Design a protein around this ligand. Structure first.
Ligand SMILES: CCCCCCCCCCCCCCCCCC(=O)OC[C@H](COP(=O)(O)O)OC(=O)CCCCCCCCCCCCCCCCC
Ligand SMILES: CCCCCCCCCCCCCCCCCC(=O)OC[C@H](COP(=O)(O)O)OC(=O)CCCCCCCCCCCCCCCCC
Ligand SMILES: CCCCCCCCCCCCCCCCCC(=O)OC[C@H](COP(=O)(O)O)OC(=O)CCCCCCCCCCCCCCCCC
Ligand SMILES: CCCCCCCCCCCCCCCCCC(=O)OC[C@H](COP(=O)(O)O)OC(=O)CCCCCCCCCCCCCCCCC
Ligand SMILES: CCCCCCCCCCCCCCCCCC(=O)OC[C@H](COP(=O)(O)O)OC(=O)CCCCCCCCCCCCCCCCC
Ligand SMILES: CCCCCCCCCCCCCCCCCC(=O)OC[C@H](COP(=O)(O)O)OC(=O)CCCCCCCCCCCCCCCCC
Ligand SMILES: *[C@@H]1O[C@H](CO)[C@@H](O[C@@H]2O[C@H](CO)[C@@H](O)[C@H](O)[C@H]2NC(C)=O)[C@H](O)[C@H]1NC(C)=O
Ligand SMILES: *[C@@H]1O[C@H](CO)[C@@H](O[C@@H]2O[C@H](CO)[C@@H](O)[C@H](O)[C@H]2NC(C)=O)[C@H](O)[C@H]1NC(C)=O
Ligand SMILES: *[C@@H]1O[C@H](CO)[C@@H](O[C@@H]2O[C@H](CO)[C@@H](O)[C@H](O)[C@H]2NC(C)=O)[C@H](O)[C@H]1NC(C)=O
Ligand SMILES: *[C@@H]1O[C@H](CO)[C@@H](O[C@@H]2O[C@H](CO)[C@@H](O)[C@H](O)[C@H]2NC(C)=O)[C@H](O)[C@H]1NC(C)=O
Ligand SMILES: *[C@@H]1O[C@H](CO)[C@@H](O)[C@H](O)[C@H]1NC(C)=O
Ligand SMILES: *[C@@H]1O[C@H](CO)[C@@H](O)[C@H](O)[C@H]1NC(C)=O
Ligand SMILES: *[C@@H]1O[C@H](CO)[C@@H](O)[C@H](O)[C@H]1NC(C)=O
Ligand SMILES: *[C@@H]1O[C@H](CO)[C@@H](O)[C@H](O)[C@H]1NC(C)=O
Lengths: 573, 145, 573, 97
């Protein structure tokens, strides 16, 4: 009966594990971001999930109902957890939208991203498609057509709008046909991702210069480990990938698990999450090292050609090594021609290029599409990989939607007029109509604005409130005795210390150091595309930027003290 | 031409004959440089052509550069053409069956790569699994009687 | 519960249906052989099978036991039926041997039959491989190395010997692991042949000039329908393909079928046999018409090239049509050169070529291997088709072996010393050691000697004896009443007349006309390979040829009057 | 040569220059026959070559057959080369890059 473990993996695997993790890893050197991940996981990944599953089996009640019965001070954590996932779903659906788009654009020969367009003269390729590669251009222009600045709001684009519409429609269909999609089918949906990842690992590992990718991803470079931004980002990636804080897990083990063990189950799920992350982040980086070394060799060959053309030299004389020697020998040759061309000599090195080659929030897309054009058959692997990604996305999507469809339908006041199908349609409708914003020309700016902050700050506050409450408002020994009574086992001091001792201190120390290094530099610069050059410049935020993040974080996690105040006023009459 | 180039062939006017005479002169130059170690300046007017027909076909012969009474023997012209045939073909887009030098045949086409006659090893492994199944089955049969 | 019909097809499909039928069809014009087949099938194919299945359900006893209980005059028909299949198995196994061989020779690139060898001069291909095609040479030389005459016995060849050994070994394994191979697996083994035949039909139908093959196979040309040889050959092909006379069918419905209907079952099986034959004989002949028209176009183009070379003519001037016109215009041109080359002008026409292009007992091999080299991938389709053929062969093989393993083990005198495995090993041993003869250099001559006659004459005698006995020795009305009593149905007069009225007369009239037209011409000429030319010349039989066919037919069907005599002497003491 | 033919290239001696001059003369003949409708007998000695370098590179220009002071304008030579470029490439096994 292996079905339980495959069901557990189904619970586990999401899209912050396969898509967000590689991007966030690359964003901070990789090797100098990987070790912090393991650290924060070992020290606050496991015990928090243990505690949450334990209290979920204990109370056997809804998210809001559990914290209502626990304490009066704890009325707003449930509604905060609901609105968090509510805000999540909107900007979460556009990823499925893009996967749909790339799938639809793969029924051809050749693939549209595989060849650059032509100029008006029909002589050479479009230089816009040459500064960027054959893929990056297709990503930032064809499917996005982003504006180089944020100040250019612009008009709504309609192809991604339509694709997002279809995504929301298929979401609605999957939710409307029952609150289940597993059972005798879990094997298929749980084995597909691993299988395609193995195939793509075999592919991307027989690619030249792939070793550089792994070498760069693994080496720890101790210069940004002293930056707490990577620390908080890793902590948040773990929190968001494990579904904690959202309340889906505290609600999953409510009408289930009479007296089974939560420690073993949670340990399996957390280990599988970490293994999925660390494995899926190896194929991408092998391929990314391949892309980096190819770009480097191309730069080298181009400058060698310019050199052998300008003065004169037997072809094949400046290949890869003697260049420097030649570079010297041509200095004393005739500097009256050498100095006058020196400002054109391109100066490119491998590690500097490998640092920033494909970076950005669309990393997975640009690297995978670059790897698919290198296959033997193209449409097949394309549609297979994109179907895998879309299926994982829709699975995570329905998982997220459960945690919001359930806690709104149980209240007997709101579900008196309309049944569930009606309110489900209304929420899908408002969700699409608000997420249309990312379809705008400068929509990816809103996307990267939303993602990190709305996934980080509110969740980090709610989890700390949950822990400090369950520990120092209910009593550790009381819950220990309750578990000893319900299951017949004694908790180890291992969790006894880790539930209130270390993690509550470490998380707030990291938060304070994050908010303190925020004032050591000033305001922040996000990104920009610079189509004229084809790289990622670092334009600054506009005025209303800070304001909109302020309202985001406020509306996301300023609800717990409001329930604390409501308790104060409801005790006075 | 019709055989090789199909519905794409060029017509054969006298400029094609000029190019052909130039190709043969080049082929002779190369041979006399790389073998006889001399250096003789053949031109396109030392290749004499005769009996031009419409089915595309003619005779030719090569003389020394300015000594018109001096004729390079047939054998050496054949040698010099074997050496550069793959180039004269490419100059006209022909493939050694649409350009025949009657009396010269190409004979470099030998295919051979059977290491062990690999059919035999597959037969052997199948015979092996056959006999192992047979012995296991007679085992189980005679035992359980 | 569709399993019964697929079991019936399993009972039905053999190798006289897929391999022998196309060869025998081509041997006599095809269209002028197809209609006689339908005639003899409708008039004596169905009712004889009906009668046999009926009496098998009636007696519910062994082959020999049934005819022992029926009448005393009927003791030898059982042993004759046994020795017939015994003689069959030997020359039947070499087909599986050849299929194994071709399978083993298909794990390469390119396939060995796809390219001709070279001469000692390395200038042109071996002319032996050019007179014959790239396949016919591989068939008559590589895997056979036949001698141009029968008088050249020669030494034993060892590669086909070894392959036949492996075939007998796998026969022994399949028989030793139970007397069954079906059950929840019948779908796969019954659907494989049809599926691959559909694929090969789709292939061989998108081949140029394929229409000529079907057109030739279907048109009836009324010049050999007046030849009774085609008649007897079609009758025998039907008899041999339906498993009658061998006793396997009279024994199959013995320990089975308590009171079910035999008419419907036998009708289904006979219709399915005929449909399988007529369908499988369409793909082969489409491909064979393709091969014929290709050979014709090649002849035409060769003579056109010779013409345009010898006098002089713009290339591409003599394509396919104006040739005759040109052929005229070059007569008045300069006959002092035209007459002196006229004896070299090849004179080839489409129908004369299509008559005899691949004919012979290896027809299926030479045509299918020619079709496989024309595929996109080669090893795949090769091994698939040959595995299909080998599986059908081994199925028919075990089916044949059942009808001889059963009736020898029931007698209590012979099965007192040794169990079944021992005698099975002995019979496989003697069968291999006698079938080694076909491995000889001139072994195919022995093969074609055995096939037609041992499959025709003995079977035709045994069936007529069976019919005349069951009808006019037991009484038609008596058996009619017995069936009415056992099953509760009244037989139609349809079978009442056809069991003794028409077929007993027609079969003996055809036999007499066959043996009468044998003396209107004299002795017979069989075939010959003529490697020097590459066609099929018609050498005459040697002296001992007639003697060996005489002993074959005697030993095969001179056992019924011997039992009639044994009854005479056992009534005198 | 090293770029195109890889580890198979021929060396470039003066017979290759002879063949190149012959190819260009043929290309000029064809153009003057199929466009100007004239018929001029250019030879391999009406293609003047200058500044031969080892990185393979030189200048050339075409004159009338025997009137050495008569130079075919640059534009017409470019036209005549566009017309037969795919043939000059094939004569040397080069691919337009
Ligand atoms: C991808 C994103 C979009 C996906 C797709 C989303 C679209 C789904 C949205 C569906 C919205 C409508 C759901 C239809 C449900 C079934 C329709 C049906 O059965 O109708 C029968 C039927 C429809 O009309 P018929 O044509 O006569 O059958 O309605 C009735 O006759 C029942 C009588 C209704 C009584 C009205 C009084 C109710 C309120 C009382 C006073 C309080 C007012 C507050 C109202 C509460 C509203 C919040
Ligand atoms: C996307 C956003 C998601 C939103 C989802 C949130 C859904 C639940 C929001 C409310 C949760 C916060 C709890 C606040 C406490 C309720 C206030 C109150 O009781 O009023 C005092 C109220 C008096 O307050 P006063 O106005 O100050 O006098 O007491 C009453 O007399 C009300 C009578 C109760 C009527 C029974 C109705 C049964 C439905 C209740 C179930 C709803 C809770 C869902 C929990 C599920 C677990 C089973
Ligand atoms: C490489 C992929 C993962 C490899 C592991 C394969 C699967 C391991 C199965 C887990 C074994 C547990 C089986 C069931 C028993 C439950 C365990 C238990 O009772 O715990 C309470 C157990 C009870 O001990 P007590 O203190 O005597 O009560 O707690 C412990 O003392 C064990 C502490 C071990 C800490 C975890 C192991 C690693 C810690 C050291 C630093 C690790 C470096 C990280 C680098 C990793 C690189 C990949
Ligand atoms: C590859 C060739 C295949 C060969 C397979 C053939 C196997 C059977 C061959 C014999 C069939 C021909 C029937 C001839 C009649 C037998 C002669 C006779 O009875 O002797 C008279 C014999 C007297 O003859 P006398 O020598 O003239 O006095 O009567 C006896 O007293 C013999 C005592 C009988 C002993 C019982 C033995 C039980 C085994 C008998 C079963 C064998 C028949 C198989 C049929 C299966 C159906 C159940
Ligand atoms: C591909 C074609 C080839 C396929 C492969 C074919 C090869 C299979 C052939 C197998 C032949 C041998 C079968 C072995 C059967 C099991 C062996 C076994 O269990 O042996 C135990 C055993 C073998 O010796 P062990 O090493 O002491 O075990 O034999 C005995 O000890 C039993 C004592 C035997 C008594 C002998 C007296 C029997 C006859 C009495 C007088 C009448 C004489 C007439 C004889 C009748 C012969 C027709
Ligand atoms: C094309 C593939 C085959 C097409 C046939 C599809 C399947 C047919 C299912 C058979 C129908 C029988 C269903 C069950 C009823 C049993 C029949 C029955 O009762 O028979 C006794 C039935 C009883 O009649 P009674 O004489 O009144 O007792 O006998 C007959 O009278 C029917 C005679 C029909 C003869 C067979 C049909 C063809 C004969 C005419 C010449 C045929 C030309 C051949 C050329 C063919 C070209 C392809
Ligand atoms: C690549 O390296 C060369 C050599 O270091 C750089 O040339 C130097 O450029 C700096 C300006 O940053 C000058 O101050 C130095 O004088 C230059 N070196 C010499 C020897 O003159 C070159 O600038 C680098 N590439 C780029 C794009 O800056
Ligand atoms: C032109 O070539 C011919 C032969 O190819 C030369 O004739 C030879 O002349 C020498 C002396 O001049 C004689 O000893 C030979 O017997 C001649 N050979 C033959 C075959 O007759 C002739 O000399 C050459 N002329 C020039 C100017 O080089
Ligand atoms: C192909 O057809 C031609 C024309 O019918 C044949 O030439 C005739 O051959 C016969 C011999 O069988 C002569 O009696 C005739 O006189 C020939 N015709 C003429 C016009 O002379 C030719 O023989 C045929 N091909 C072959 C191989 O026999
Ligand atoms: C050689 O070519 C030059 C120019 O290519 C010819 O010069 C022309 O001569 C005519 C009269 O002879 C003058 O009217 C033109 O003005 C000249 N052109 C130039 C550009 O000066 C010259 O005639 C040609 N010589 C021959 C013998 O054909
Ligand atoms: C060639 O195309 C370029 C496009 O950048 C254009 O600027 C230029 O004018 C064109 N040249 C001609 C001669 O049309
Ligand atoms: C590089 O330059 C050095 C210096 O002369 C030379 O020895 C070497 O052969 C050159 N390598 C190549 C590949 O041209
Ligand atoms: C060429 O090969 C053929 C083979 O038929 C042989 O008879 C002939 O002598 C060979 N020619 C030479 C010159 O070796
Ligand atoms: C065949 O010959 C006739 C007779 O002149 C001619 O009209 C026709 O074009 C020729 N066809 C071909 C394909 O050469």
């Amino acid at each position: 009966s292996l079905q339980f473990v495959f069901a557990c993996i189904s619970y586990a695997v999401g899209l912050g594990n396969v898509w967000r993790f590689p991007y966030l890893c690359q964003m901070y050197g990789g090797g100098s971001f990987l070790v912090p991940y393991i650290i924060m996981l070992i020290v606050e990944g496991m015990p928090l999930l243990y505690l949450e599953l334990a209290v979920g089996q204990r109370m056997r009640q809804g998210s809001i109902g559990a914290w209502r019965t626990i304490s009066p001070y704890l009325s707003g954590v449930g509604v905060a957890s609901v609105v968090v996932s509510f805000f999540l779903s909107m900007y979460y659906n556009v990823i499925n939208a893009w996967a749909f788009w790339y799938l639809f654009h793969s029924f051809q020969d050749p693939l549209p991203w595989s060849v650059c367009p032509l100029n008006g003269n029909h002589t050479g390729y479009d230089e816009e498609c040459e500064k960027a590669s054959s893929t990056q251009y297709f990503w930032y222009r064809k499917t996005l057509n982003i504006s180089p600045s944020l100040q250019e709001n612009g008009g709504v684009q309609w192809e991604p709008a339509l694709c997002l519409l279809l995504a929301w429609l298929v979401v609605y269909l999957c939710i409307l046909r029952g609150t289940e999609s597993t059972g005798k089918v879990v094997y298929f949906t749980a084995s597909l991702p691993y299988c395609v990842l193995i195939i793509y690992l075999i592919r991307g590992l027989t690619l030249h210069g792939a070793t550089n990718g792994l070498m760069y991803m693994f080496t720890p470079k101790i210069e940004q480990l002293a930056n707490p931004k990577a620390w908080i980002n890793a902590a948040t990636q773990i929190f968001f990938s494990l579904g904690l804080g959202f309340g889906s897990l505290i609600a999953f083990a409510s009408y289930n698990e009479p007296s089974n063990n939560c420690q073993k189950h949670a340990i399996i799920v957390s280990l599988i999450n970490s293994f999925t992350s660390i494995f899926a982040s190896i194929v991408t980086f092998s391929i990314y090292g391949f892309k980096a070394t190819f770009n480097y060799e191309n730069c080298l060959k181009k400058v060698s050609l310019l050199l052998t053309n300008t003065f004169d030299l037997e072809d094949g004389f400046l290949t890869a090594s003697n260049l420097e020697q030649v570079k010297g020998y041509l200095a004393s040759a005739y500097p009256s021609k050498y100095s006058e061309m020196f400002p054109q000599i391109k100066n490119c090195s491998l590690e500097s290029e490998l640092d920033t080659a494909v970076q950005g929030t669309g990393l997975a897309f640009i690297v995978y599409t670059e790897a698919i054009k290198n296959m033997e058959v193209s449409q097949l692997w394309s549609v297979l990989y994109f179907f895998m990604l879309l299926m994982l996305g829709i699975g995570s999507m329905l998982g997220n939607t459960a945690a919001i469809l359930t806690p709104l339908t149980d209240s007997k006041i709101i579900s008196s007029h309309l049944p569930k199908e009606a309110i489900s349609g209304l929420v899908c409708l408002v969700n699409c109509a608000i997420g249309m914003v990312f379809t705008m020309e400068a929509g990816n700016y809103w996307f990267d604005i939303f993602n990190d902050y709305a996934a980080t700050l509110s969740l980090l506050l709610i989890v700390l409130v949950e822990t400090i409450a369950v520990c120092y408002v209910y009593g550790l020994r009381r819950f220990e005795s309750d578990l000893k009574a319900m299951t017949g086992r004694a908790v180890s001091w291992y969790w006894k210390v880790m539930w209130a001792g270390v993690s509550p201190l470490l998380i707030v120390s990291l938060f304070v150091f994050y908010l303190s290094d925020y004032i050591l530099t000033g305001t922040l610069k996000y990104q920009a595309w610079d189509a004229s050059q084809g790289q990622l410049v670092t334009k600054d935020y506009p005025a209303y930027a800070l304001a909109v993040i302020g309202l985001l974080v406020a509306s996301s996690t300023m609800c717990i003290p409001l329930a604390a105040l409501g308790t104060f006023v409801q005790r006075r009459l | 031409l019709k055989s090789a180039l199909g519905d794409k062939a060029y017509e054969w006017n006298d400029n094609e004959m000029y190019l052909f005479r130039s190709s043969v002169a080049y082929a002779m130059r190369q041979y006399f440089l790389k073998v006889k170690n001399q250096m003789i300046l053949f031109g396109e007017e030392d290749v004499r052509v005769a009996n031009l027909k419409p089915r595309i076909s003619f005779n030719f012969f090569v003389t020394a550069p300015k000594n018109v009474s001096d004729i390079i023997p047939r054998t050496e012209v054949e040698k010099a053409i074997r050496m550069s045939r793959s180039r004269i073909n490419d100059a006209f887009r022909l493939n050694d069956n649409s350009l025949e030098f009657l009396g010269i045949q190409p004979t470099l086409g030998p295919p051979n790569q059977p290491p062990v006659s690999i059919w035999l090893i597959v037969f052997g492994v199948v015979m092996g699994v056959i006999v192992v199944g047979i012995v296991i089955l007679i085992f189980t049969g005679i035992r359980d009687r």
